[PDB]
Design a protein around this ligand. Structure first.
Ligand SMILES: OC[C@H]1O[C@H](O[C@H]2[C@@H](O)[C@H](O)[C@@H](CO)O[C@@H]2O)[C@@H](O)[C@@H](O)[C@@H]1O
Ligand SMILES: OC[C@H]1O[C@H](O[C@H]2[C@@H](O)[C@H](O)[C@@H](CO)O[C@@H]2O)[C@@H](O)[C@@H](O)[C@@H]1O
Ligand SMILES: OC[C@H]1O[C@H](O[C@H]2[C@@H](O)[C@H](O)[C@@H](CO)O[C@@H]2O)[C@@H](O)[C@@H](O)[C@@H]1O
Ligand SMILES: OC[C@H]1O[C@H](O)[C@@H](O)[C@@H](O)[C@@H]1O
Lengths: 144, 140
């Protein structure tokens, strides 16, 4: 709605769908991983309020991406893996205009990659259960 | 503008179609790998056809009817003749999926578009289709 662009999700069809929408300012992403990507905390601000939403399960070790002023997400990549009979994110990483993060997770499968020649990530959607079944992103231009 | 990709290598020369008002058809030229593409589209009242990459292989045309649009692109980035190029390429419309076109396996990529459409292309081309990316636009 209202001109959104959503690409993905990459991953499986298990778990429950989630959708943050494109209206919030992402300030940090915490990826929980071990053998696979267990889940993600997305922290954002909106009208001066800070909120965190958790997607996926409770396992794994956290890895944080804390955006600095003028830093934005410009890429996402990883691997879709078969794990415990589920199709989930085995690995997940991100690029900002400042550096590369991850990938986090230790199970390979089918790679995916989202290089963004022009634009940036403005929100997330996907599916979560015990692990992070799938992830996709909202996009918006770098400026205008 | 929203430009995602390109997927592929760093050889050949850069190309950039820019966005179209409507894509009418795409022809994927392929053999062992993806040789190139034709794109026929409307633009500020005009109908145009552009060719990117080489013209070896055989063309595979996808014609889009009005109300039909491109909602996915996928393929494999392969190593061929000492170059990194598109080994396979396919597209999905809101009606059906087409492809793969090309026969050389490599690193897969996929671009499902949950909301939006492909409105144009950019990338690199030489003898073959070294790299390809897309312009995205929201649905009307
Ligand atoms: O997030 C992955 C997966 O987690 C949960 O399922 C687990 C287990 O109960 C299932 O038997 C297997 C195979 O489906 O997968 C996991 O180990 C569920 O939340 C499931 O919906 C979800 O896909
Ligand atoms: O990311 C999934 C899961 O990975 C790790 O656990 C694995 C292994 O190290 C454990 O020994 C066995 C126990 O049966 O479970 C997995 O195969 C941990 O990092 C875990 O927290 C995480 O959820
Ligand atoms: O589009 C692929 C490739 O095409 C042309 O190069 C061909 C040949 O002349 C080269 O020897 C090998 C190795 O680079 O690749 C092709 O077979 C050039 O236009 C090149 O830049 C481009 O990558
Ligand atoms: O796809 C690369 C190459 O593969 C084969 O050799 C033929 O189909 C050619 O016409 C084509 O150019």
């Amino acid at each position: 709605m209202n001109g959104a662009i959503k690409v993905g999700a990459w991953g499986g069809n298990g778990g429950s769908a989630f959708d943050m929408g494109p209206a919030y300012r992402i300030i940090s992403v915490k990826i929980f991983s071990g053998d696979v990507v267990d889940g993600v905390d997305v922290t954002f601000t909106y009208y001066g309020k800070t909120e965190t939403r958790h997607y996926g399960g409770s396992g794994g070790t956290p890895h944080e991406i804390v955006l600095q002023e003028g830093e934005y997400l410009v890429g996402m990549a990883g691997e879709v893996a078969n794990y415990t009979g589920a199709v989930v994110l085995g690995k997940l990483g991100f690029s900002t205009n400042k550096k590369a993060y991850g990938p986090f997770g230790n199970t390979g499968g089918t790679p995916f990659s989202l290089p963004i020649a022009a634009g940036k990530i403005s929100g997330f959607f996907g599916r979560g259960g015990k692990f992070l079944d799938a992830i996709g992103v909202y996009l918006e231009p770098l400026e205008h």
